[PDB]
Amino acid sequence: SGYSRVLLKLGGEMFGGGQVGLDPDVVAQVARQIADVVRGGVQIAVVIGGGNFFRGAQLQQLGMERTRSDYMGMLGTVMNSLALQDFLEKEGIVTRVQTAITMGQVAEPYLPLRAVRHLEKGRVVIFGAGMGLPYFSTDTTAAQRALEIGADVVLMAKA
Amino acid sequence: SGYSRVLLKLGGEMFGGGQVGLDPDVVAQVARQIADVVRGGVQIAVVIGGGNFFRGAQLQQLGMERTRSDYMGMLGTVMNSLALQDFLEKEGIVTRVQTAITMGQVAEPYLPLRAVRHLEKGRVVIFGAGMGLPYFSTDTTAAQRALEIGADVVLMAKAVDGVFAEDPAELLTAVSHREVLDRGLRVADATAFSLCMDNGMPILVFNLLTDGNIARAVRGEKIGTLVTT
Amino acid sequence: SGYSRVLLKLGGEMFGGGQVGLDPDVVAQVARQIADVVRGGVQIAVVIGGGNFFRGAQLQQLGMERTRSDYMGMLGTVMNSLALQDFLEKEGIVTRVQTAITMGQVAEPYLPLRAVRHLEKGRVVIFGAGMGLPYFSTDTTAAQRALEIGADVVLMAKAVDGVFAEDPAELLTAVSHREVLDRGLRVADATAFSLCMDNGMPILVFNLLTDGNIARAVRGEKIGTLVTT
Amino acid sequence: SGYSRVLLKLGGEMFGGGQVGLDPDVVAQVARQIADVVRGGVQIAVVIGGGNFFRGAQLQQLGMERTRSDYMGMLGTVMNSLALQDFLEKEGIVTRVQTAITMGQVAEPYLPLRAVRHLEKGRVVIFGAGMGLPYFSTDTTAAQRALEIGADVVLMAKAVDGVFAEDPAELLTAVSHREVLDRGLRVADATAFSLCMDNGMPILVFNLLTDGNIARAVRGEKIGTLVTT
Amino acid sequence: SGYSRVLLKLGGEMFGGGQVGLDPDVVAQVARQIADVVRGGVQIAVVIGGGNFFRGAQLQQLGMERTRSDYMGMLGTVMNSLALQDFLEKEGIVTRVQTAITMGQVAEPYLPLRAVRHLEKGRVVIFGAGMGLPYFSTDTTAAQRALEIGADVVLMAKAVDGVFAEDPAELLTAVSHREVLDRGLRVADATAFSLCMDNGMPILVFNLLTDGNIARAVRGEKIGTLVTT
Amino acid sequence: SGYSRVLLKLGGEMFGGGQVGLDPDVVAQVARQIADVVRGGVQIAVVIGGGNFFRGAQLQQLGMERTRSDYMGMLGTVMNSLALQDFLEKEGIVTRVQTAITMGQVAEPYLPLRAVRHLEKGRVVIFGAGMGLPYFSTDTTAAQRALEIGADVVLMAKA
Ligand SMILES: O=c1ccn([C@@H]2O[C@H](COP(=O)(O)OP(=O)(O)OP(=O)(O)O)[C@@H](O)[C@H]2O)c(=O)[nH]1
Ligand SMILES: O=c1ccn([C@@H]2O[C@H](COP(=O)(O)OP(=O)(O)OP(=O)(O)O)[C@@H](O)[C@H]2O)c(=O)[nH]1
Ligand SMILES: O=c1ccn([C@@H]2O[C@H](COP(=O)(O)OP(=O)(O)OP(=O)(O)O)[C@@H](O)[C@H]2O)c(=O)[nH]1
Ligand SMILES: O=c1ccn([C@@H]2O[C@H](COP(=O)(O)OP(=O)(O)OP(=O)(O)O)[C@@H](O)[C@H]2O)c(=O)[nH]1
Ligand SMILES: O=c1ccn([C@@H]2O[C@H](COP(=O)(O)OP(=O)(O)O)[C@@H](O)[C@H]2O)c(=O)[nH]1
Ligand SMILES: O=c1ccn([C@@H]2O[C@H](COP(=O)(O)OP(=O)(O)O)[C@@H](O)[C@H]2O)c(=O)[nH]1
Ligand SMILES: O=c1ccn([C@@H]2O[C@H](COP(=O)(O)OP(=O)(O)O)[C@@H](O)[C@H]2O)c(=O)[nH]1
Ligand SMILES: O=c1ccn([C@@H]2O[C@H](COP(=O)(O)OP(=O)(O)O)[C@@H](O)[C@H]2O)c(=O)[nH]1
Ligand SMILES: O=c1ccn([C@@H]2O[C@H](COP(=O)(O)OP(=O)(O)O)[C@@H](O)[C@H]2O)c(=O)[nH]1
Ligand SMILES: O=c1ccn([C@@H]2O[C@H](COP(=O)(O)OP(=O)(O)O)[C@@H](O)[C@H]2O)c(=O)[nH]1
């Protein structure tokens, strides 16, 4: 019955609604759901994707380098992470965004010990930038994060 | 007559085609123009915008916080910078991308002296992430970067052939910063234009889409609008 | 009532006493004032200026390059920041120094989220190196830092009792940004004032040297000049 | 005959003229001397001091913490390094500035192999921030840098004509490290002199202000004091 | 009576057992001693040596260049630091390793303020790569690090119970720096001892192998040799 | 007949002679051989190991972390690279040492374009620090370097 540590897999559709970009309504309602579950006394780590901006397969079909395409996708994931952080902060929630790409001015570097400390402090963890390396999927990143931070359950958003 | 160091300011429309996202054809033609002007033998620093992804004021009035909105806009600027770098390097042009927000795995940090050296080595110096500070714009980013790298001119690449007396109109040719302020034209943002006028930096608003326009402007042909002093 | 988050702005006079170098007495006075304000329970970010060492415009007038002059001025700001950190640690106040120019061994890189967390934890957050870019100034640095951290007010520390109608003879009390622009008053430079007006950050110009003035201003007493929206 | 690789050592007097701050005339004289030496075909690494701004020992005597005082002094050395770089670029000499404290935007991190390569390529290699560690001094910095890059001589630039037997009255010509230690002469501080003696690096103390003295010393003429093995 | 901040200098013998390489048992017992003294409630910075791998003077007299010899020695120091960190963390002790030679993937860079914060957080601050500069030793590295982090004492961990009047002899108890210089004892290298004496840093030479010796020295029990002033 | 770009795989035995440490005689004679082949008009990239100092299997058997053990091994490889660079410089050869671990004060970061430029300039390339990541072998690093820098032949030293 229930869980204590949940990793929520959010995709670009959860931030775009099908259209390319950012739709404040969908992100606001998913932030409301996360607020409900976190006030229900659960620890939440949300791993965020960037399909609403870019995908490596589509950029390779357009004819760009795989490494550059994956870095652009990770940047899109970080943008979605910032948007979700803002919408969660609008509901009185303390959130910590960790990016696998070291961008200190934007967020904090990925550290599983810091992440589990934040989870134990009640803060909502937001894993962006994927795994920080090319040739990876956000589902693989979600599995790795769940295995590392000891998340007892993984739940994927659906449309 | 002629500019050796140009700072090409490319707004988000130059990557999105007026829409939201990335347009491969517009980026390809911009890359072709940049490659032509590089093979002409010019030192070019390209300041990227992110209006095709996000704007801080727009997101703030939508409801989001200005700081995170600005950081999302700067990340979109970095994405556009990466796209332009890929398209330029698809044509044999050596490009170095520098971001004012330190992201080592993505691009080298902002080193102005190394950027000047890259320019002297015949490389296109792409400037992303703006100035790395919220409550600012890519226009003042372009002004500051052009002033620091000692650029000869700031080439504002727009979809129109130049600035007009009133939005649809007469297309002006050569104006001054004081005249622009008096007439209330639209060359750049308030802070950007204030800095550019205080430091006496020549601006050249021109239509980049017309083939060879950037080459003519660099060679010194009287096209577009020249805001000088 | 009163301001919970203040961004103090200290100029080179607050570290040089009107001369070139460093006067320990003035820095000790500033440290005592900031210490009692912190003991009052206020979140405070200070922004340091380096006019007591170098001004980029003056060095450019002398003949040096503007970019190098600006970097020398920013290094002077970092030096004054370290001096203030020392004098504040003498008073048992925990301080965190952040420099816009990344120098990890000397201080930590500018991280606004870390700065606001340090403000929450009762630490004085000192800002050196300005904004890290040439052609700007510490007034623009103060405005941008206050906007980004979310500071309630910007406290301009001066040696005089606020903004006057005519520099030497009337002492103003409360005005607006538009009123200051119309009357041609001097609060900050053009870029900083434009940014502050566009974002509506309240400014309080007051004499820090007089004992208790900063505490009174934080509590909300009517002292100096209050430039509001 | 003569020295091919020299490590010039400039103190705060060479940038302040005996006062606090920066005197452009003395820096211009130093730049002219270094420029003509480089035009002579010599590899030169300069090491900058910051006594014209701050001394850690004096600040500790005043009451500040020694570590922070030393970091302020190193930042002052970096500022003087930037001033010298500007004045050398005014003379058309290519310079590379390396700071022991990593500040990538201002200069490049201290890389000895890069420094010797820059020396090979005809660039003056300027060293700021000392050795990057507190409690040391620019004399120790000069000794260590000369040992590491492989400089043939260490040229101590002073305002007097070399080392004297008694500070104000005899002017020495050539001595050894042991002779200097026995007679109690002043060339460098204890740590730098100990390191130099243990490694046998030749020292030449001479007046840089007099025109052509550094060129004569590089060619091999007998001027100033030569402390050899 | 008692030291709160200790800088434990561990020579290469403490990792090699007198041989060349790494001895797991000696490192394990050193880690046990450090863990005991940490659980005693002390702030400890451990400066590592690399004599069990290489010495610059030895390689120079063998024929290799001094600079590369010193860099190999510093890399061996970093390897010993990593081994000590692993053995300490095998016992539940939180250790932070800092190297004066920037190697991000191996260890965090040398940040003295962050190291002091780690000490205040009850973490063992390991110092590797010496001071990152050739023509220096881990003894002067230890002296400089202890002076900068404001350590209470420098604990020289040797295989003997203290310094003697002559190598095999009377074991001294409490001496001064001047007395050590006059008697020609062996506490540290020339430069290291000069710096330590000039800055008045207390040294404590003791046998680390004897269980509880470090704990007794920290608590203030009169063991080993205390070089004070 | 002959080659133009040769990748020489050197192991810790080539620097120790069986004993733990550094033996100047073996490294001096291998430097003499490299001098002969480079004056014969060949481009040489030498990938160096660190078995003379440490091995991941031995350190794991002793009971240390795999990541730390591999970093110590890479540091040993860098030390061997510095020794070989010194002994090659003793014979009037320009050598460039590239380490996969970014240690700017010691050497230059690994860049295949810079490496091939140095090879075309006649300088001898010295690949140390392996591939910069744990769980890799120096033979795997040699294969990767040969495939990247376009080395036409790979030759492994033998005892
Ligand atoms: O971190 C850094 C690196 C480099 N720089 C600055 O970059 C400029 C050159 O950056 P380079 O690395 O191009 O030096 P270089 O000109 O010597 O290049 P080569 O001759 O080897 O082709 C130099 O002026 C240096 O100070 C920095 O300011 N910071
Ligand atoms: O490099 C960094 C580190 C941290 N941060 C951001 O700074 C803010 C505070 O980072 P702190 O580490 O100062 O506070 P913390 O609450 O995150 O940890 P505790 O104090 O509870 O131990 C956090 O929101 C973090 O994401 C960065 O932006 N960059
Ligand atoms: O980060 C670095 C880069 C370079 N170096 C070392 O600096 C020395 C010179 O590095 P340079 O790049 O200045 O000279 P180069 O000869 O290596 O390249 P060209 O000038 O031929 O273009 C080389 O020996 C390199 O290994 C470092 O130690 N660290
Ligand atoms: O790059 C850096 C990072 C940190 N520092 C210096 O490290 C010291 C503390 O380093 P911390 O990162 O521990 O700051 P903190 O004390 O706020 O840690 P928490 O409260 O979040 O646990 C601060 O004094 C900072 O200036 C640097 O000097 N440079
Ligand atoms: O560790 C990671 C995380 C993300 N990505 C790239 O990020 C882009 C967008 O992420 P995804 O396609 O996984 O987003 P979703 O489909 O979950 O919205 C893709 O090109 C991925 O290759 C990557 O390469 N490595
Ligand atoms: O230095 C900078 C550059 C960009 N931005 C943010 O990124 C967005 C995109 O920049 P701009 O709007 O200047 O791009 P354009 O529409 O000219 O392409 C801006 O709205 C800001 O919110 C910023 O905050 N600081
Ligand atoms: O972002 C910044 C902030 C400051 N400065 C330099 O800082 C020096 C002194 O700062 P200011 O003139 O703002 O100091 P004040 O007059 O307030 O003492 C000037 O040379 C500026 O160029 C700079 O270059 N960039
Ligand atoms: O490695 C170094 C070199 C210099 N300095 C500081 O630099 C300042 C001025 O340097 P010096 O006293 O060597 O200058 P000079 O007397 O030669 O002008 C002093 O406060 C030193 O502490 C330092 O801390 N570490
Ligand atoms: O700051 C430092 C520390 C170490 N080393 C080199 O590393 C070797 C090992 O250090 P030491 O000889 O001081 O170690 P111990 O024998 O005391 O363990 C020295 O010989 C030097 O060549 C160096 O050059 N500078
Ligand atoms: O890319 C690399 C290169 C080396 N190593 C480690 O380096 C150590 C010594 O290297 P090796 O054992 O490959 O040396 P050799 O047997 O060639 O002398 C081993 O523990 C390897 O795991 C590693 O982990 N990754």
Residue F137 annotated as part of some ligand binding site? yes
Residue to mutate (ligand 5; options A19, A48, A66, A138; most atoms within 8 A of CB): A138
* DSSP-assigned letters across all residues of D52-70: TT--HHHHHHHTS-HHHHH
Instruction: Tokens for D165, please give them.
Output: 């037997």
Three-class secondary structure assignment of chain B: CCCCEEEEEECCHHHHCCCCCCCHHHHHHHHHHHHHHHHCCCEEEEEECCCCCCCHHHHHHHCCCHHHHHHHHHHHHHHHHHHHHHHHHCCCCCEEEEECCCCCCCCEECCHHHHHHHHHCCCEEEEECCCCCCCCCHHHHHHHHHHHCCCCEEEEEECCCCCECCCCCCECCEEEHHHHHHHCCCCCCHHHHHHHHHCCCCEEEEECCCCCHHHHHHHCCCCCEEEEC
Distances in whole angstroms, Cα of residue D97 to Cα of each of C161, D76, D85, D126: 44, 14, 7, 5
Find the angle CA(C103)-CA(C104)-CA(C110) to the nearest 5 degrees.
75
Question: What percent helix, strand, coil does chain F show, rounded to 5?
Answer: 45, 20, 35
Q: What burial class does residue C169 get, using C-beta atoms within 10 Å of its C-beta: 0-12 exposed, 13-18 middle, 19+ buried?
A: exposed
Sheet holding C153-158, edge to edge: C108-109, C95-99, C124-128, C43-48, C5-10, C153-158, C203-207, C225-228, C174-176
Tell me the DSSP string of F17-45: TTSSS--HHHHHHHHHHHHHHHHTT-EEE
One-character DSSP codes across chain D: ---SEEEEEE-THHHHTTSSS--HHHHHHHHHHHHHHHHTT-EEEEEE--TTT--HHHHHHHTS-HHHHHHHHHHHHHHHHHHHHHHHHTTT--EEEEESS--TTTSEE--HHHHHHHHHTT-EEEEESTTS-TT--HHHHHHHHHHHHT-SEEEEEESSSS-BSS----B--EEEHHHHHHHT--SS-HHHHHHHHHHT--EEEEESSSTTHHHHHHHT---SEEEE-
Alpha-carbon span C209 to C214, nearest angstrom = 9
Atom of ligand 6 nearest to the CA of B135: 24
Q: What is the resolution of this structure in A?
A: 2.8
Cross-strand bridge partners of residue A136? none
Nearest residue to D99 (alpha-carbon basis) of D145, D56, D136: D145
Select from D71, B198, D80 the least CA-distant residue to C140.
Answer: B198
Task: Report which of B98, B52, B45 is spatially closest to residue B72, judged by C-alpha positions.
Answer: B52
Would strands C174-176 and C43-48 be described as parallel, antiparallel, or unpaired?
Answer: unpaired
Residue found by looking up tokens 């002579």 in the block: D40
Could you give the angle at which helices E190-198 and E138-148 cross, rounded to 10 degrees? Answer: 20
> E117 C-alpha vs ligand 4 centroid, how far in Å?
7
Question: Which tokens go with B53?
Answer: 């992804």
Nearest to C15 by CA among C68, C99, C77, C61: C77
Helix axis angle for A112-120 and A138-149, nearest 10°, is: 70
Task: Say if strands C203-207 and E174-176 run parallel, antiparallel, or are unpaired.
Answer: unpaired
Domain boundaries, chain C: 1-229
Q: Which of B72, B91, B116, B96 is nearest to B31 (CA)?
A: B91
Place of tokens 């990557």: B15
Structure token digits, residue A116: 């589990």
The answer to whether E54 touches E76, Cβ cutoff 8 Å, is yes
Cβ neighbours of residue C78 closer than 8 Å, sequence gap 6 or more: C48, C50, C99, C101, C103, C106, C107, C128, C129, D75
| Contact state of A83 with B105 under an 8 Å Cβ cutoff | no
From the list D222, D210, D227, D201, the residue with the least C-alpha distance to D45 is D201
Question: For residue E138, what are the CA distances in angstroms to E68, E127, E145, E163, E200?
Answer: 16, 10, 10, 19, 18
SS3 C151: coil
Q: Is A15 helix (H, G, I), strand (E, B) or coil?
A: helix
C-alpha–C-alpha distance, residues E88 and A101, integer Å:
30
Alpha-carbon distance F11 to F9, whole Å? 7
Which of D32, D36, D30, D37 has the alpha carbon at shortest distance from D15?
A: D30
Cα of A34 vs its chain's centroid, Å = 12
- Cβ–Cβ under 8 Å, residues A130 and A136: yes
Return the CATH superfamily for domain F1-159: Acetylglutamate kinase-like (3.40.1160.10)
Question: Do D147 and E135 count as a contact with CB atoms less than 8 A apart?
Answer: yes
Closest CA to C190 of C116, C137, C118: C137
d(CA C209, CA B197): 36
Kindly list the strands in the beta sheet with F108-109, ordered across the sheet, starting from the edge strand earlier in the chain.
F108-109, F95-99, F124-128, F43-48, F5-10, F153-156
Of F20, F105, F132, Cβ closest to residue E102: F105
Query: How do D203-207 and D225-228 pair as beta strands?
Result: antiparallel
Tokens (6 digits) for B173: 């040719």
- The candidate with the shortest Cα–Cα distance to B172, out of B97, B98, B224, B219, is B224
CA distances from E36 to A153, E31, E33 (A): 40, 9, 5
Which residues are bridge partners to B99 per DSSP?
A: B109, B128
Within 8 A of D136 by CB-CB distance, chain E residues are 144
DSSP for A41-87 reads T-EEEEEE--TTT--HHHHHHHT--HHHHHHHHHHHHHHHHHHHHHH
B-C interface (Cβ pairs under 8 Å ≥ 3)? yes
Instruction: Give me the residue label for tokens 């649809």.
Output: B168
Chain D residues whose CB is inside 8 A of the B109 CB are 104-105
Three-class DSSP category at A148: helix
Burial of D142 (0-12, 13-18, 19+ CB in 10 A): buried
**Nearest Cα to D50, choosing from D171, D138, D169, D147?**
D138
Q: Do chains A and C touch (3 or more CB pairs under 8 A)?
A: yes
The DSSP symbol for E170 reads P
Q: Please, is C198 exposed, middle or buried when counting C-beta atoms within 10 Å of its C-beta (0-12, 13-18, 19+)?
A: middle
Question: Nearest to residue D43, comparing CAs of D54, D34, D52?
Answer: D34
Residue D145, both tokens: 């840098």
Tokens 């004021």 belong to B57
Q: Which single residue is written with the structure tokens 């490496």? A: F115
A101 to B106: CB separation less than 8 angstroms, yes or no? yes
Which experimental technique did the depositors report for determining this structure?
cryo-EM
Report chain breaks in chain E, C–N > 2.5 Å, as residues after which they occur: 168
Question: How far off is chain D from E192, nearest CA to CA, in Å?
Answer: 9
Let me know how long chain A is: 159
Q: Which of C157, C144, C165 is nearest to C204 (CA)?
A: C157
3-state SS class at C6: strand
The Cα C122–Cα E136 span in angstroms is: 41
What is d(CA B135, CA B14) in angstroms, rounded to the nearest whole number? 22
Closest CA to E205 of E228, E229, E178, E182: E228
Query: Which DSSP symbol is given to E195?
Result: H
Question: What span, in angstroms and rounded, lies between the C-alpha atoms of A46 and A10?
Answer: 7
Dist CA E36 CA E213 (whole Å) = 11
B11 is in an annotated binding site: yes
Tell me the residue length of chain D: 229
Torsion of the alpha carbons at F58, F63, F66 and F69, rounded to the nearest 10: -60
Q: Is F132 annotated in some ligand binding site? A: yes
Nearest to B78 by CA among B29, B2, B141: B141
**Contact across the interface for B66 and C190, Cβ inside 8 Å:** no
The span from the CA of E22 to the CA of E31, in Å, is 14
> In 3D, which of E225, E227, E216, E229 has the Cα closest to residue E1?
E216
d(CA E183, CA F126): 49
The pair of structure tokens assigned to C104 is 């990890």
Residues of D in contact with C22 (CB under 8 A): 54
Lateral strand order in the sheet of D108-109: D108-109, D95-99, D124-128, D43-48, D5-10, D153-158, D203-207, D225-228, D174-176
**Ligand 8 within 6 A of CB of D137:** yes
Which partners does chain E have (≥3 C-beta pairs < 8 Å)? C, D, F
Q: Which two tokens stand for residue E61?
A: 């007299």
Burial (CB count within 10 angstroms: exposed 0-12, middle 13-18, buried 19+), residue E175: buried
Mutate one of F95, F97, F105, F123 to test the D interface: name it (highest D CB count within 10 A).
F105
Q: Quick one: angle between helices F66-89 and F24-39, nearest 10? A: 60
Question: Tokens in use for B138?
Answer: 């890519």
Q: Tell me the shortest Cα–Cα distance from C120 to chain E, in angstroms.
A: 18
| β-strands E203-207, E225-228 pairing | antiparallel
Give the number of other CB atoms < 10 A from CB of residue F69.
23
Give the integer Cα–Cα distance in Å for C144 and B70: 12
Q: Which residues of F touch E90 (CB under 8 A)?
A: 63-64
The candidate with the shortest Cα–Cα distance to A122, out of A92, A144, A155, A78, is A92
Looking only at the bridges linking them, the beta strands covering B153-158 and E153-158 are unpaired
If 0-12 CB within 10 Å is exposed, 13-18 middle and 19+ buried, where does residue B147 land? buried
Pick from A105, A107, A108: which is nearest to C110 by CB?
A105
CA of B102 to the centre of ligand 7 (A): 23
Encoded tokens for F150: 């376009």
Between CA D119 and CA D122, with CA D120 as vertex, the angle to 5 degrees is: 65
Distance CA(C131)–CA(C77), nearest Å, equals: 11
Is B76 assigned a ligand-binding role in the annotation? no
Task: State the Cα torsion C44-C47-C52-C56 to the nearest 10°.
Answer: -170
Our CA dihedral for D163, D164, D168, D169, rounded to 10 degrees, sits at: -160
Q: Which chains touch A (3+ CB pairs under 8 A)? A: B, C
Which two tokens mark D135?
Answer: 């409690």
Q: Which of E23, E29, E134, E32 has its CA nearest to residue E75?
A: E134
| Residue E24, min C-alpha distance to chain C (Å) | 33
| Sequence-ordered list of residues with C-beta below 8 angstroms from that of D83, at least 6 positions apart, any chain | C64, C68, C72, D15, D22, D27
Angstrom distance (rounded) from CA F105 to CA E99: 12
CB F49 less than 6 A from any atom of ligand 10: yes
Is B134 among the annotated ligand-binding positions? Answer: yes
Greatest Cα-to-Cα distance within chain B, rounded to the nearest angstrom: 48
Q: Which atom of ligand 5 is nearest to the CA of A57?
A: 20
Contact at CB, E133 and D147, closer than 8 angstroms: no
Q: Which residues of D touch C79 (CB under 8 A)?
A: 53-54, 72, 75-76
